[PDB]
Write a protein that binds this DNA or RNA. Structure first.
Length: 97
DNA sequence: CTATGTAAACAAC
DNA sequence: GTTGTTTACATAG
């Protein structure tokens, strides 16, 4: 990573799409195909944990929310939320076990 | 303390 | 296995 974060990158892939929504697979594709850094799924396929990491960021903060299709199958798109308003602390971890 | 990055133990598939 | 969460620890600043 030259300058940016996983958090940001994801929010970025999801930013420039024909229509706003992406999917892990699709997100994963962005990563592997853009910015020399990731190489995993490209022509060949899969290196370790970044796979697991991206899932973390997405599910964790406040810019990403998930949307499925009510129907029989798997349309889970990752979109962005709350832009007009800003404020809202995110329980920044450690109370405890 | 805070944000980032990881590694991994898991509820549903 | 895949997707989604959520503990937990590691730093760097």
């Amino acid at each position: 990573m030259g300058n940016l974060s996983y958090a940001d990158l994801i929010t970025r892939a999801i930013e420039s799409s024909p229509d706003k929504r992406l999917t892990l697979s699709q997100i994963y594709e962005w990563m592997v195909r853009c910015v020399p850094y990731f190489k995993d799924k490209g022509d060949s396929n899969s290196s370790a944990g970044w796979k697991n990491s991206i899932r973390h960021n997405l599910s964790l903060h406040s810019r990403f929310m998930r949307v499925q299709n009510e129907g029989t199958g798997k349309s889970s798109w990752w979109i962005i939320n709350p832009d007009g308003g800003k404020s809202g602390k995110a329980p920044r971890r450690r109370a405890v076990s």
